[PDB]
Amino acid sequence: PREIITLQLGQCGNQIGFEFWKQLCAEHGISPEGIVEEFATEGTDRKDVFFYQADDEHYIPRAVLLDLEPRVIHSILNSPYANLYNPENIYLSEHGGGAGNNWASGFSQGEKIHEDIFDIIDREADGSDSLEGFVLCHSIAGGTGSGLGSYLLERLNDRYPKKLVQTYSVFPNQDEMSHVVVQPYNSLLTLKRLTQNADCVVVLDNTALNRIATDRLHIQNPSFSQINQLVSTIMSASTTTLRYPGYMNNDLIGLIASLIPTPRLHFLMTGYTPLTTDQSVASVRKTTVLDVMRRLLQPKNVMVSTGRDRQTNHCYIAILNIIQGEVDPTQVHKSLQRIRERKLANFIPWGPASIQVALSRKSPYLPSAHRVSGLMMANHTNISSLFERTCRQYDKLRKREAFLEQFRKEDIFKDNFDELDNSREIVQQLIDEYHA
Amino acid sequence: PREIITLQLGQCGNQIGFEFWKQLCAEHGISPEGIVEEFATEGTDRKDVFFYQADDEHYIPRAVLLDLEPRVIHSILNSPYANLYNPENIYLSEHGGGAGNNWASGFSQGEKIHEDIFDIIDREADGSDSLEGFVLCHSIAGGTGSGLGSYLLERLNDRYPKKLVQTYSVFPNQDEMSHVVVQPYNSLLTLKRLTQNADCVVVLDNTALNRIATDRLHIQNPSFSQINQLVSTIMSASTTTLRYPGYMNNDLIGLIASLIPTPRLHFLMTGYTPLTTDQSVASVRKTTVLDVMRRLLQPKNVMVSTGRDRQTNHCYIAILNIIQGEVDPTQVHKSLQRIRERKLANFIPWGPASIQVALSRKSPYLPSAHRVSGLMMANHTNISSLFERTCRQYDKLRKREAFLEQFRKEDIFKDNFDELDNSREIVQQLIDEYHA
Amino acid sequence: SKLMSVCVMFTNCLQRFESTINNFDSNFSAHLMDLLDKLSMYSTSDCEHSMINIIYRLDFNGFY
Amino acid sequence: LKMERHFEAMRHFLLMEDGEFAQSLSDMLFEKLGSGQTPSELLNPLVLNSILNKALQYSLHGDSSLASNLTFALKYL
């Protein structure tokens, strides 16, 4: 019916998808090894849209996880949520990889394991006779997720041409350049494949993570154990119309169709306010829906590093405001009434704009059926500031003679560096041209 | 809508604005860290006119506080009212300044921190699309509030030309000249900026403070802890038409428009009678409004050091008499009936005068809904006696060779002393010419 | 029926694998004039209570 | 009847003693600026009856229970 195959790949893409499947059992009322609660069918009306359909009421995840590093998968099998995963769909015990840290490693390893990489991931494709598409849950940081992920964006474009492609990709961190220095090279090589060899992306910045991780979360030493908490909730938040029973844009080709203006303009800004557990003691007094979307357009919950004074000459075109759970829908048109009076979104002068609001009932659970949740999927034309940030860090590195002799020994014979530079400037010029 | 940004600045301007925000929570029925009372919306019909508008029913103050001395801000964070203030709007922890005591220090420090001083205070400007104006809650005493405050009166005049400017500035003390001796220099340099680079001021004398501080308050050793009690009440008294729901002159550009005769004549005399707590036991017998404005024009509550025998050749032009709370409005026209019979205000012989009276309901509180309050905003032409007092102390100091070699080493190359002297005499001559 | 015909006109030129784009633009302006005539028909309804207030909020939502 | 609550509601929007509505009327007086230079379409009551309902939420006062008691009729002169 609407079966999606997630493509978890890389050192960071496997960990953000590990707790994504772990989030799904707590809201479906199911255990990874059994069914102890009856809340799975009376409370939740649809479960076989991301999981594989049941053979013994055991909803297998439709997931594949490949990585060159064996460290990310050795921290999985000792956890009690790995018995839900199957040891025959992806790998058996003692799976390995390369050495290995290179963008050209996984780019060259795709055609030497070409027979095996297109054998076991295609067995899940013909399980349903109407496949939705493929989401590449991969990474941009490092050479593991960026090297091999650029290969599958090409060969799955023609072997599966009538399928939706759209990824939840995480952006790397640009604070210092000591541990990694190959960061401007492997990022722009995948970013070219994300626009012409891929339809849509969902950007997730790393410098904007610790802006939120010290905002309300109150940590002193930033660890990697907090990167899975902001990411796994908004992943399950994006499929609330798709997993839980909704009516309009209840498919993944429903939501993405109403937000993309044009190809190579698909970078969607994400926002999510409620992350604090001591808000729970004051939501008993009928906290309404009239105050939760006034702060979405206000740049506080954003996960995109952008300029603060560059929003006057940029214009919103498509903005999504997803409320979940208890909505009190007699005032949801009242919340959309107050949008035109502030004009917090700059509107495009050539065409109409749209503020789309939708709702779906959440899990039968006490932290879910009590507190209001707001998921934002914006589309603003100030996203070229990240593309100006990455390009200015790209041409400055090529004048310092950095990784021009250390990178072209394997499988690179011609200069494909300006092939990425002009196509990035094509994106940056057509964005500003789009508001005439 | 009607959002005003207060510019608290200097050693004395930060302390008089600290209890000004602390006064506002006791009358709005709110706590600086929470909302425990429901009296904030049923009793008070408007709260988002000085505070920032709410995101979690947390009314953030629209305040900025800069000072060279870190002593005034280190006595803030240990008080429980500092959590209402934000540590990202103005400064984070461990903010500092100069050494420092000079008028030329802050006058030269404005263009070296020119990038940062016009960055974070402009973020609160575009929060509302219709900004009211700017009030400079600064000081004249010392070189801290007078040195840097003269710079923002110039660069905010053209960058924000369509905004109201009007300040509640405190005058320094002229009793002896031992601890400070630079008092005639830094005062007249700011007083020139208060007339041509500023529209209106609200004068607050220091020698008239201890006239009232020993009148009914009964202290033996005058401390600085009493200077915030007379000042913070009349600040909140001046916005009772603006904060609480009124009808006429309910804006700050409403009150100041009906009192200023002409530019460079804007020095308003202030009066406020009720400051005694043992009056409360006899206000239960319907103390009326017919006796509270007979003593306003009588020179007893004034905060301006002026001559007692100089009121016969001077004439009132505009006088404001603000009653608050319980008014009994069936006799408020009866109180204005008795004004023409005494003629306690000398009227200008060239044009008409005006005795404007207005009312607004006070806070739902027992010391506020029981005792009558009278706020005076006079405008009398005997205010040149202070300008004759400051000028006679200015030219006498320049003949004693005082601070002519100790003041012109930094950023002063020409004699700008008579540039302040003639413009002060222009004010003093046009005041006496104004009654033809 | 005019709105359904343009999407029938759309889905055949996407079915193929010149002249079709000006046929789309002429049919685009044709239904734009009819929805503006439909926009006046909502506002000339009865000069009455909230059934004109509901359909007004249809009309401003289609405008921005 | 609950008449005293309706009595207070008439005072706030006809007698103008909660002056936030009549201050917002000055902004509606800041939308005319001399007469006549305004459209004569039938959309002229359609967008002008709205902006007075939108002006009450602009001052953040009152529910929609008394807001049904206020209506605006644009006369023609």
PDB file of C-alpha atoms in Angstrom, chain A residues 40-178:
ATOM      1  CA  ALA A  40      -2.035  -1.336  19.456  1.00  0.00           C
ATOM      2  CA  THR A  41      -5.246  -1.806  17.432  1.00  0.00           C
ATOM      3  CA  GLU A  42      -7.992   0.004  19.370  1.00  0.00           C
ATOM      4  CA  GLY A  43      -5.883   3.117  19.954  1.00  0.00           C
ATOM      5  CA  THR A  44      -3.776   3.081  16.785  1.00  0.00           C
ATOM      6  CA  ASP A  45      -5.761   2.449  13.603  1.00  0.00           C
ATOM      7  CA  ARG A  46      -2.791   1.920  11.255  1.00  0.00           C
ATOM      8  CA  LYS A  47       0.579   0.297  11.941  1.00  0.00           C
ATOM      9  CA  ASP A  48       1.723  -1.303   8.653  1.00  0.00           C
ATOM     10  CA  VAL A  49       3.028   1.799   6.910  1.00  0.00           C
ATOM     11  CA  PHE A  50       6.677   1.875   8.098  1.00  0.00           C
ATOM     12  CA  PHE A  51       6.907  -1.589   9.631  1.00  0.00           C
ATOM     13  CA  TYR A  52       6.717  -4.744   7.574  1.00  0.00           C
ATOM     14  CA  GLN A  53       3.295  -6.365   7.742  1.00  0.00           C
ATOM     15  CA  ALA A  54       2.830  -8.975  10.413  1.00  0.00           C
ATOM     16  CA  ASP A  55       3.289 -12.736  10.292  1.00  0.00           C
ATOM     17  CA  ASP A  56       2.836 -13.423  14.026  1.00  0.00           C
ATOM     18  CA  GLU A  57       1.876  -9.889  15.134  1.00  0.00           C
ATOM     19  CA  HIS A  58       5.604  -9.109  14.946  1.00  0.00           C
ATOM     20  CA  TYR A  59       5.920  -5.849  13.007  1.00  0.00           C
ATOM     21  CA  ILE A  60       9.377  -6.184  11.418  1.00  0.00           C
ATOM     22  CA  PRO A  61      11.060  -2.853  10.569  1.00  0.00           C
ATOM     23  CA  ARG A  62      11.605  -2.220   6.859  1.00  0.00           C
ATOM     24  CA  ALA A  63      15.154  -1.052   7.501  1.00  0.00           C
ATOM     25  CA  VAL A  64      18.646  -1.588   6.112  1.00  0.00           C
ATOM     26  CA  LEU A  65      21.812  -0.419   7.882  1.00  0.00           C
ATOM     27  CA  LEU A  66      25.192  -0.408   6.120  1.00  0.00           C
ATOM     28  CA  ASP A  67      28.323   1.292   7.438  1.00  0.00           C
ATOM     29  CA  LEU A  68      32.072   0.891   7.052  1.00  0.00           C
ATOM     30  CA  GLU A  69      32.572   1.310  10.810  1.00  0.00           C
ATOM     31  CA  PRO A  70      31.581  -1.717  12.946  1.00  0.00           C
ATOM     32  CA  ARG A  71      31.433   0.389  16.129  1.00  0.00           C
ATOM     33  CA  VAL A  72      27.916   1.727  15.498  1.00  0.00           C
ATOM     34  CA  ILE A  73      26.437  -1.765  15.104  1.00  0.00           C
ATOM     35  CA  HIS A  74      28.276  -3.331  18.063  1.00  0.00           C
ATOM     36  CA  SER A  75      26.437  -0.892  20.359  1.00  0.00           C
ATOM     37  CA  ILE A  76      23.119  -2.281  19.065  1.00  0.00           C
ATOM     38  CA  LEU A  77      22.952  -6.034  19.754  1.00  0.00           C
ATOM     39  CA  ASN A  78      23.464  -5.691  23.518  1.00  0.00           C
ATOM     40  CA  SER A  79      20.477  -3.347  23.679  1.00  0.00           C
ATOM     41  CA  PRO A  80      17.142  -5.192  24.112  1.00  0.00           C
ATOM     42  CA  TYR A  81      15.628  -3.439  21.061  1.00  0.00           C
ATOM     43  CA  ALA A  82      17.834  -5.313  18.561  1.00  0.00           C
ATOM     44  CA  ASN A  83      15.790  -8.532  18.659  1.00  0.00           C
ATOM     45  CA  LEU A  84      13.103  -6.655  16.726  1.00  0.00           C
ATOM     46  CA  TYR A  85      15.717  -6.184  13.999  1.00  0.00           C
ATOM     47  CA  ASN A  86      16.432  -9.243  11.872  1.00  0.00           C
ATOM     48  CA  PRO A  87      19.910 -10.777  11.420  1.00  0.00           C
ATOM     49  CA  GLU A  88      19.104 -11.883   7.860  1.00  0.00           C
ATOM     50  CA  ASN A  89      17.666  -8.737   6.218  1.00  0.00           C
ATOM     51  CA  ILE A  90      20.887  -6.696   6.314  1.00  0.00           C
ATOM     52  CA  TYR A  91      23.798  -8.628   7.840  1.00  0.00           C
ATOM     53  CA  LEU A  92      24.461 -11.554  10.127  1.00  0.00           C
ATOM     54  CA  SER A  93      26.823 -11.430  13.102  1.00  0.00           C
ATOM     55  CA  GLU A  94      30.363 -10.031  12.643  1.00  0.00           C
ATOM     56  CA  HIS A  95      29.799  -7.572   9.829  1.00  0.00           C
ATOM     57  CA  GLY A  96      32.661  -5.252   8.952  1.00  0.00           C
ATOM     58  CA  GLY A  97      33.727  -2.686   6.375  1.00  0.00           C
ATOM     59  CA  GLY A  98      36.711  -0.628   5.243  1.00  0.00           C
ATOM     60  CA  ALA A  99      39.622   0.779   7.218  1.00  0.00           C
ATOM     61  CA  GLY A 100      38.457   3.663   6.650  1.00  0.00           C
ATOM     62  CA  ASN A 101      37.913   7.400   6.191  1.00  0.00           C
ATOM     63  CA  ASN A 102      37.516   8.763   2.644  1.00  0.00           C
ATOM     64  CA  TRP A 103      34.801  10.018   0.337  1.00  0.00           C
ATOM     65  CA  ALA A 104      36.455   8.069  -2.496  1.00  0.00           C
ATOM     66  CA  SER A 105      36.385   4.876  -0.406  1.00  0.00           C
ATOM     67  CA  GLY A 106      32.616   4.358  -0.357  1.00  0.00           C
ATOM     68  CA  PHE A 107      32.316   5.861  -3.837  1.00  0.00           C
ATOM     69  CA  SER A 108      34.610   3.099  -5.131  1.00  0.00           C
ATOM     70  CA  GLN A 109      33.201   0.381  -2.846  1.00  0.00           C
ATOM     71  CA  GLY A 110      29.739   0.688  -4.405  1.00  0.00           C
ATOM     72  CA  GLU A 111      30.685  -1.033  -7.670  1.00  0.00           C
ATOM     73  CA  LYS A 112      32.754  -3.838  -6.113  1.00  0.00           C
ATOM     74  CA  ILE A 113      29.917  -4.984  -3.819  1.00  0.00           C
ATOM     75  CA  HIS A 114      27.480  -4.051  -6.594  1.00  0.00           C
ATOM     76  CA  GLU A 115      26.059  -7.585  -6.753  1.00  0.00           C
ATOM     77  CA  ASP A 116      25.349  -7.857  -3.012  1.00  0.00           C
ATOM     78  CA  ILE A 117      24.114  -4.293  -2.412  1.00  0.00           C
ATOM     79  CA  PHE A 118      21.326  -4.736  -5.010  1.00  0.00           C
ATOM     80  CA  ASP A 119      20.290  -8.238  -3.879  1.00  0.00           C
ATOM     81  CA  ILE A 120      18.958  -8.200  -0.315  1.00  0.00           C
ATOM     82  CA  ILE A 121      17.552  -4.652  -0.286  1.00  0.00           C
ATOM     83  CA  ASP A 122      15.393  -5.493  -3.320  1.00  0.00           C
ATOM     84  CA  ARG A 123      13.742  -8.421  -1.513  1.00  0.00           C
ATOM     85  CA  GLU A 124      11.744  -5.922   0.569  1.00  0.00           C
ATOM     86  CA  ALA A 125      10.696  -4.009  -2.563  1.00  0.00           C
ATOM     87  CA  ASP A 126       8.389  -6.676  -4.023  1.00  0.00           C
ATOM     88  CA  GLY A 127       6.719  -7.373  -0.673  1.00  0.00           C
ATOM     89  CA  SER A 128       4.139  -4.708  -1.513  1.00  0.00           C
ATOM     90  CA  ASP A 129       2.985  -4.300  -5.115  1.00  0.00           C
ATOM     91  CA  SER A 130       2.630  -0.499  -4.703  1.00  0.00           C
ATOM     92  CA  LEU A 131       5.863   0.903  -3.291  1.00  0.00           C
ATOM     93  CA  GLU A 132       5.868   4.446  -1.913  1.00  0.00           C
ATOM     94  CA  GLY A 133       9.532   5.315  -2.318  1.00  0.00           C
ATOM     95  CA  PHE A 134      12.922   5.490  -0.650  1.00  0.00           C
ATOM     96  CA  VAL A 135      14.193   7.717   2.156  1.00  0.00           C
ATOM     97  CA  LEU A 136      17.992   7.842   2.493  1.00  0.00           C
ATOM     98  CA  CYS A 137      18.550   8.208   6.243  1.00  0.00           C
ATOM     99  CA  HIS A 138      22.211   9.020   5.699  1.00  0.00           C
ATOM    100  CA  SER A 139      24.769  11.562   6.866  1.00  0.00           C
ATOM    101  CA  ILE A 140      26.848  14.319   5.330  1.00  0.00           C
ATOM    102  CA  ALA A 141      29.519  14.407   8.071  1.00  0.00           C
ATOM    103  CA  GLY A 142      32.494  12.118   7.561  1.00  0.00           C
ATOM    104  CA  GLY A 143      33.429  10.104   4.512  1.00  0.00           C
ATOM    105  CA  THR A 144      31.432   7.018   5.460  1.00  0.00           C
ATOM    106  CA  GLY A 145      27.899   8.347   4.977  1.00  0.00           C
ATOM    107  CA  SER A 146      28.848  10.818   2.242  1.00  0.00           C
ATOM    108  CA  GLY A 147      30.985   8.473   0.134  1.00  0.00           C
ATOM    109  CA  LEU A 148      28.587   5.565  -0.328  1.00  0.00           C
ATOM    110  CA  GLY A 149      25.375   7.618  -0.143  1.00  0.00           C
ATOM    111  CA  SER A 150      26.191   9.487  -3.354  1.00  0.00           C
ATOM    112  CA  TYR A 151      26.263   6.201  -5.290  1.00  0.00           C
ATOM    113  CA  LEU A 152      22.736   5.042  -4.419  1.00  0.00           C
ATOM    114  CA  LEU A 153      21.278   8.428  -5.400  1.00  0.00           C
ATOM    115  CA  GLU A 154      22.270   7.644  -9.017  1.00  0.00           C
ATOM    116  CA  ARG A 155      21.528   3.946  -9.575  1.00  0.00           C
ATOM    117  CA  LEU A 156      18.160   4.033  -7.787  1.00  0.00           C
ATOM    118  CA  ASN A 157      17.044   6.974  -9.942  1.00  0.00           C
ATOM    119  CA  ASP A 158      16.621   4.836 -13.081  1.00  0.00           C
ATOM    120  CA  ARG A 159      16.074   1.349 -11.637  1.00  0.00           C
ATOM    121  CA  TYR A 160      13.173   2.768  -9.584  1.00  0.00           C
ATOM    122  CA  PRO A 161      12.096   5.866 -11.536  1.00  0.00           C
ATOM    123  CA  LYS A 162       8.460   6.124 -10.382  1.00  0.00           C
ATOM    124  CA  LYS A 163       9.292   6.261  -6.655  1.00  0.00           C
ATOM    125  CA  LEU A 164       9.502   9.241  -4.314  1.00  0.00           C
ATOM    126  CA  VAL A 165      12.956  10.185  -3.090  1.00  0.00           C
ATOM    127  CA  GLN A 166      13.343  12.519  -0.074  1.00  0.00           C
ATOM    128  CA  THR A 167      15.930  12.362   2.723  1.00  0.00           C
ATOM    129  CA  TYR A 168      16.311  13.416   6.356  1.00  0.00           C
ATOM    130  CA  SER A 169      19.999  14.285   6.058  1.00  0.00           C
ATOM    131  CA  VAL A 170      22.011  15.863   8.879  1.00  0.00           C
ATOM    132  CA  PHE A 171      24.457  18.688   8.177  1.00  0.00           C
ATOM    133  CA  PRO A 172      27.982  18.551   9.655  1.00  0.00           C
ATOM    134  CA  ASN A 173      29.502  20.903  12.220  1.00  0.00           C
ATOM    135  CA  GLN A 174      31.587  23.926  11.181  1.00  0.00           C
ATOM    136  CA  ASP A 175      33.041  25.118  14.495  1.00  0.00           C
ATOM    137  CA  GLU A 176      36.723  24.181  14.119  1.00  0.00           C
ATOM    138  CA  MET A 177      38.515  22.186  11.420  1.00  0.00           C
ATOM    139  CA  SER A 178      41.141  20.206  13.362  1.00  0.00           C
TER     140      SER A 178
END
